[PDB]
Structure formats: structure tokens, C-alpha cells
């Protein structure tokens, strides 16, 4: 009848389309590369049919063949023009369908021959969508082809609007497409960009404070022992001092060092530094003289607010303002003229090699403003200033409760470590809410308390949730870099791994793979913080800042690299599991012991596990799983147990039973005191996985296939997982595409295949 050029780079040469056309006695030339006018394929060609063709036709060709170039595009064509139409159809939540259409000079903007709505299920995977759509448009082709050849169809222009995507746009999401529609959209709801309508934070802290002074001026602000300052009193005093400070040349972004013990003077000083226009640098006087000299040196601070007591610890490093000298205090009690922007520094705190972290006003403001309503903080509340001067926990303590008009209580040294006496003080003063570091918290749970409405903990891994009090318990999480905590969770029931929860106002958290691409929900990956909490970075360490605070390759958003491992739960709450990915690997494999410990722990008989890597004295390391238990558990059983969730190379080669773990006084178990193991010290075991080793080797092109070896750390991909299953189905037993992403190693796949057809 007539000669047909079939243009495709993705679809096979055995398509239903091609075969139907041949069934009609058409000679079908198949071309998967870009052609020019001179090309031999273009000789004697009546109709050109393009299906998932990766190239653009030269305008010459499109004009000479005008009216006769048909394209099959799996989407409501106005929608999802360009690359990956089905994927973007699911992600952007556009209308669904398939369109057969004329080709014009632009990308899928030609007039529509025949169009048909399609529907996807919540439980279908993205691959399912892809295939169903291809199927539907092929069937559509077959139905309407005759009415296309006889030109008896009216092509109508496309509806205005629609969307266009390019080749690179799907990069960020390259891992998602074995994911389900439901799961994908959930990942969208969690991780996608913030909704329109928002505006930058326009306030500085001392603004919100002074406002809160005017609203509640007579109410107590901060209490130390018996003595108190009302919000008006505190504000006035801090204003006097601040007038003196700004009078000494303190400007926006200027560092001002404060070295004092927990007191009213400390609050006075912090607020004074703020009001005078600077950022404050907290120095604990109980630090070694060395770290003190260093904090003073690294800091550009020219002024030091301090006691006559701790004066000399400075060694004359800077100008000293004594908080006990009346001359340090101006007569003026009025608010100073505002010189500040929310992007000015509010404080610099050091972490420990010790880095000075620069936090801005809008960071703090975001945190306070999320804190007050979330915990329902009213002036009825009373809070503890517990955490050290130089930790961000102090920032939470002071600032979150000042702006809600609450009452700060200073903790004295004696009460601080005696949690029994501090409990007593809390019950006598009726302290409603506070933040205790993990382990301090756990201890307070022992003390019978009826003073707290809410306690908040984080900074170390919470494990004990049992408590004598009637109060709600919260586990939060967040680096000093992103201004205190970027997540919070309400602990309702016990957990083996207590989740860290959901993000706060104006902060998103992204679970990423090593390549900085999104992970599907439930799949572990590094935790990246995006949003309002991200600070300015480390002081005088611009390269280190450049390493930690990154500009996303695909996205271009400023994000923080925590170095923490974490994953999303189905209910959205974030779960913490380890750090970097280091300490040591094993046998050529990147391994985290932390990743293994929980899978070990849910074994009904063991209550505590830690796993370590030890040296064979050959220079490299092997894996030892340490477990506390009633009695020794047989190695085979543990190997199988871990084997159900983990890849074999993660399964430790050793498993020590102990009746009890040795403990350091501070922290839980000591590693140095822990026993050590030793050994002088793989191909497919059975012939089933040895026969699928062949199909792996043939899909991806590897010489040798191991039992532990992954499918995806070799560069397996959507196409190759498919090629795997498609090829295996007709030379062997079929598999499901989910099974391969859940059980991606060789022997895991084997465990399936063996327990699959046999049951």
C-alpha cells in the first residue's frame, strides 16, 4: 500500500503499532536516530509515525511531509508536553490521557487527531502508569488509524495552557519511579516546594520583645532565687546598658562577648547586646582558659560584658564592661532606635576543632513564633533556664518563653545536677514547661513530678519514655547550624526507634541519596535541612561553609548537609538512624553499624545491641554484633533474623552474647571497655542464584556476579530492572518489580524466588 517510517528511540521494534501497520501490508522502516533530508530512510515515504522519538525533525522535513507526520504522545497533550509525560502527569496532578497528533515546528504543539482520557490507580506504580498509557495509546492508534489515513478526522487546536517538561527535569526524581502513585504524591506533599503567598520575616527579636513588654509590662519576666524582674524592669535596665553599648560603637552584625554565670545580669546583658544592635557571644566561665582565649580570638568581639569575678579569665583580650558598675548603665530607659534587619546576626555559638556558628534574627524569630503556638505558651507558664549559656538550648529556654510572656526561672548550680532537688523546686514554683537535654530528661522521668505540663528533649538519642508525671513528652531534633531544632515529635507510645517527627514553620527536610536525589518514603538517606532556620554559616570558615551549606544541583535551593542518616515514616514522621556513613566499611561495602543495631534489637529475646567493626591485624575490618540476652542465641538464627531485612554483606560475621554491657558513668555503653574479637579470615552459593547471576550479568554487562552484590550500586536503573524482569520471565520464573527494589541483592532475590513458587 504505502511505505511508513516509524520513529522511536524508546519503544521496541515489535510494537503492536508496527505489527498492525505491517498487517495492513505497509512496509515499515524503523529508525531510532536523527535523520536529515538526504537520509535513505526518507525515500518514498508516505506517512511518518513517531512514537517516543528522542529527536526533533529538521523543519525542512516537517514542511515537506506536512499533513503526514503523526505522533503518539502518552498524555492529555496540552498537558505534559515533552519528556516523561506520564511521570509529570502523576506528580503535577494534571489531567490524564493519551494523544495522537500532528507534528509542527514546536514540541508537541501540533493539532490533535484523537485524544483519550486515561485513569491511574492509587496503588499502581509509576512503571504501571507508563505501560498502561503506552498500551492505551497503541490501542487508540489501532482503532483510529483508518480514519487517520483517509484524513476523515478533524484535527482541532489544543486548548490553551498546559505544561512542558524537558529531559533533565526528572533528574532529581530518578529514584522514584518504582514508587506507587499514593506514595509518590505523599512524598510530594512532604518534600515539595512551599506554597505561594508567603513573605519574608520582617521582625527582629527585640522588636517582638519590646512589643511583648508593652502588652505585659507588670508581669514577671525572669526569676533568680528570690529576686525578680518584671518585663518593664528588665526592658528598662537592658535599655540603659544597651544605650551604653551602642554608645561605645556597637553596630549591626558586631560581635559582643558575654562572660557570666546564670543570673539576671545574663538576661539583662543578652537583651542589651541585642538592643544595642549587636550579636552576642556566650562564654561559659567554667571553660578552660584555652578555649576561652580561642573563643575570644576567633570572635571579632571588641567588647566583653563580664563580672569582676571572671574578668581576669579574659587576660585583657578586649574592652571590658563590668555588669556591676553603675557607669555601665545609661540614664535613658527608652527603647533604642531600631537599626536592625532580620538578616542581621543575633548570636554566635561554638560547637565542638571548634566552629563559631552564625545565627540570624529571622532564624530565631521563626523558631520562637513556631514554638509559642505549638506548645500553647501563655503568660501563665513558667520555664527553666537550664541548658548552658553557650548552647542553643539556652536560646530556646530564654527566647521562646520571653515572647509568649512567660516567666523564666534561673537554675542555680546546686539544683542543676541534683534532679531531685530541681524537681522539688519545679513543684514548689509550679514550673509548667522546659527543655532538658536527653538523659537529664530520662532521669527527671524517674523523679515524681506534677509541676510540668510539657517537657522537651533532644540532642541525644531518646530511649526511655516512661515517667512519673502527667505531662506530655516531646522529642525534637536539629543542629546548631539550623538554629536549635528543625523537627519536633509528640511521644505517645513507646518505640524501639523513637521518631524525631515533623518539621517546624518554614522548614522542609529532604531525605537524599549520595547523589542528592529524592528518596521514596521509607527509604533511608542523608537528611538535608531547607528553610528559615538555616543560619549564616561558620565564622571565618567560608570553605567549610561552602561544604556544609550547599546549592542543590537539580534544585538550586540552599540546603544544609547534616551528615545524619534518616528516613520518612508512612505517617510522615521522620526517623533517625545513624550519621555520615563512615567509622568503617566492610569487605568493600559501605556499612553503618547504627543501621544494623535496630534490626538486631527487634529480636524478641534481646534488649540491647551495639555492633562494631574490628581489625584482623591485616589492616581491614569485620563486623561484630554485640547483643545482651538471657542466653546465647545460635549464630544461624541471628543470621537468618537479620537476613530477613538486611543484605548479607551487612549481616555481621560475628555475634557476641553478653549478660550485661559495661557502662561509662556518662553515656550508655563504653566502647573501649567492650571486648574484642578476632579472625585470620563471595560467589553464588546455590545453582538457582547462579543461573540468575547469568541474567544479571547479561542485562547489565558484568563479568562476575556475587551473592551479596547489589543491582543498583552497579548502575542498575529503571530500564535495567525492567530488562531484568522482562528477560527472566521468558527464560525462567517471572518476578514482580517491587520485589527487586525491596530485595535488591542476589540472595535476597533468591530467598524470594525459593519461597515464592514453593508457597
From Swiss-Prot:
GART: annotated segments: 3-145
Residue(s) carrying O-(pantetheine 4'-phosphoryl)serine: 718
Domain Carrier: 683-756
Subunit structure: Large multienzyme complex composed of 4 subunits; LgrA, LgrB, LgrC and LgrD.
Miscellaneous comment in the UniProt entry for this protein: Linear gramicidin is a pentadecapeptide antibiotic produced during sporulation.
Similarity section: Belongs to the ATP-dependent AMP-binding enzyme family.
Role: Activates valine (or leucine, but much less frequently), and then glycine and catalyzes the formation of the peptide bond in the first step of peptide synthesis. This enzyme may also play a role in N-formylation of the first amino acid residue in the synthesized dipeptide.
Domain notes: Two module-bearing peptide synthase with a C-terminal epimerization domain, which is probably inactive. Each module incorporates one amino acid into the peptide product and can be further subdivided into domains responsible for substrate adenylation, thiolation, condensation (not for the initiation module), and epimerization (optional). At the N-terminus, contains a N-formyltransferase domain that is probably responsible for the formylation of the first incorporated amino acid.
Protein name in the entry: Linear gramicidin synthase subunit A
Amino acid at each position: 500500500m504505502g511505505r511508513i517510517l516509524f520513529l522511536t528511540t524508546f519503544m521496541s521494534k515489535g510494537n503492536k503499532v508496527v505489527r498492525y501497520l505491517e498487517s495492513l501490508h505497509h512496509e515499515v522502516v524503523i529508525c531510532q536516530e536523527k535523520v536529515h533530508a538526504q537520509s535513505a530512510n526518507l525515500q518514498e515515504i508516505d506517512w511518518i509515525v513517531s512514537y517516543a522519538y528522542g529527536y526533533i525533525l529538521d523543519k525542512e522535513i516537517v514542511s515537506r511531509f506536512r499533513g503526514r507526520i503523526i505522533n503518539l504522545h502518552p498524555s492529555l497533550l496540552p498537558w505534559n508536553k515533552g519528556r516523561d509525560p506520564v511521570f509529570w502527569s502523576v506528580w503535577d496532578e494534571t489531567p490524564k490521557g493519551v494523544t495522537i497528533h500532528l507534528i509542527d515546528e514546536h514540541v508537541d504543539t501540533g493539532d490533535i487527531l484523537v485524544q483519550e482520557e486515561i485513569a491511574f490507580a492509587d496503588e499502581d506504580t509509576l512503571l504501571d502508569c507508563y505501560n498502561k498509557a503506552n498500551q492505551a495509546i497503541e490501542e487508540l492508534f489501532i482503532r483510529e488509524w483508518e480514519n487517520i489515513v483517509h484524513g476523515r478526522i478533524a484535527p482541532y487546536r489544543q486548548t490553551a495552557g498546559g505544561t512542558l517538561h524537558f529531559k533533565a527535569d526528572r533528574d532529581f526524581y530518578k529514584n522514584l519511579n518504582m514508587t506507587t502513585v499514593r506514595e509518590l504524591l505523599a512524598l510530594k506533599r512532604l518534600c515539595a516546594e512551599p506554597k505561594r503567598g508567603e513573605k519574608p520575616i520582617d521582625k527582629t527579636f527585640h522588636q517582638l520583645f519590646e512589643q511583648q513588654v508593652e502588652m505585659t509590662p507588670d508581669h514577671v519576666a525572669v526569676v533568680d532565687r528570690g529576686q525578680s524582674l518584671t518585663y518593664k524592669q528588665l526592658n528598662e535596665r537592658a535599655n540603659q546598658l544597651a544605650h551604653h553599648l551602642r554608645g561605645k560603637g556597637v553596630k549591626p552584625d558586631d560581635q559582643v562577648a558575654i562572660m557570666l554565670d546564670k543570673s539576671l545580669d545574663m538576661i539583662v546583658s543578652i537583651l542589651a547586646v541585642m538592643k544595642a544592635g549587636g550579636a552576642y557571644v556566650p562564654i561559659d566561665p567554667d571553660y578552660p582558659g584555652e578555649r576561652i582565649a580561642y573563643m575570644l580570638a576567633d570572635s571579632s568581639a571588641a567588647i566583653l560584658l563580664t563580672n569582676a569575678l571572671h574578668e581576669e579569665k579574659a587576660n585583657g583580650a578586649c574592652d571590658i564592661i563590668d555588669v556591676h558598675d553603675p557607669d555601665s548603665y545609661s540614664e535613658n530607659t527608652n527603647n533604642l532606635p531600631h537599626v536592625n534587619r532580620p538578616d542581621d546576626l543575633v548570636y554566635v555559638m561554638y560547637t565542638s576543632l571548634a566552629k563559631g556558628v552564625m545565627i540570624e534574627h529571622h532564624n530565631l524569630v521563626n523558631f520562637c513564633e513556631w514554638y509559642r503556638p505549638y506548645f500553647g505558651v501563655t503568660p501563665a507558664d513558667k520555664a527553666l533556664v537550664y541548658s548552658s549559656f553557650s548552647f542553643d538550648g539556652s536560646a530556646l529556654d530564654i527566647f521562646t518563653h520571653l515572647l509568649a510572656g512567660a516567666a523564666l526561672h534561673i537554675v542555680p548550680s546546686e539544683r542543676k545536677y541534683d534532679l531531685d532537688a530541681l524537681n522539688d523546686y519545679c513543684n514548689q514554683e509550679g514550673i509548667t514547661i522546659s527543655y532538658l537535654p536527653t538523659g537529664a530528661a530520662e532521669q527527671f522521668m524517674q523523679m515524681d513530678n506534677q509541676s510540668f505540663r510539657v517537657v522537651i528533649t533532644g540532642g541525644d538519642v531518646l530511649k526511655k519514655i516512661e515517667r512519673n508525671g502527667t505531662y506530655k513528652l516531646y522529642n525534637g531534633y536539629g543542629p546548631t547550624e539550623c538554629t536549635i531544632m528543625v523537627t519536633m515529635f509528640e511521644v505517645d507510645k513507646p518505640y524501639a526507634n523513637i521518631p524525631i517527627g515533623k518539621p517546624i514553620d518554614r522548614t522542609r527536610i529532604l531525605i537524599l541519596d549520595e547523589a542528592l536525589a529524592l528518596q521514596p518514603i521509607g527509604v533511608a538517606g542523608e537528611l538535608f535541612i531547607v528553610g528559615e532556620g538555616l543560619g549564616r554559616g561558620y565564622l571565618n570558615r567560608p570553605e567549610l561553609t561552602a561544604e556544609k551549606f550547599i546549592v542543590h544541583p537539580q534544585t538550586g535551593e540552599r540546603m544544609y548537609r547534616t551528615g545524619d542518616r534518616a528516613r520518612f515514616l508512612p505517617d510522615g514522621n521522620i526517623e533517625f538512624l545513624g550519621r555520615l556513613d563512615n567509622l568503617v566499611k566492610i569487605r568493600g561495602y559501605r556499612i553503618e553499624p547504627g543501621e544494623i543495631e535496630p534490626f538486631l534489637m527487634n529480636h524478641p529475646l534481646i534488649e540491647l545491641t551495639t555492633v562494631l567493626a574490628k581489625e584482623q591485624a591485616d589492616g581491614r575490618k569485620y563486623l561484630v554484633g554485640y547483643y545482651v540476652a538471657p542466653e546465647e542465641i545460635p549464630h544461624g538464627e541471628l543470621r537468618e533474623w537479620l537476613g530477613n531485612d538486611l543484605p548479607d554483606y551487612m549481616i555481621p560475621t560475628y555475634f557476641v552474647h553478653m549478660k550485661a554491657f559495661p557502662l561509662t558513668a556518662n553515656g550508655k555503653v563504653d566502647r573501649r571497655a567492650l571486648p574484642d574479637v578476632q579472625a585470620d579470615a563471595v560467589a553464588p552459593t546455590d545453582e538457582l542464584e547462579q543461573q540468575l547471576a547469568q541474567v544479571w550479568s547479561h542485562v547489565l554487562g558484568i563479568p562476575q556476579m556475587g551473592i551479596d552484590d547489589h543491582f543498583l550500586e552497579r548502575g542498575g536503573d529503571s530500564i535495567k530492572v525492567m530488562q531484568l524482569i522482562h528477560q527472566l520471565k521468558n527464560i525462567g520464573l517471572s518476578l514482580r518489580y517491587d520485589q527487586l527494589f525491596t530485595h535488591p541483592t542476589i540472595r535476597q532475590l533468591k530467598r524470594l524466588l525459593t519461597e515464592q513458587a514453593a508457597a
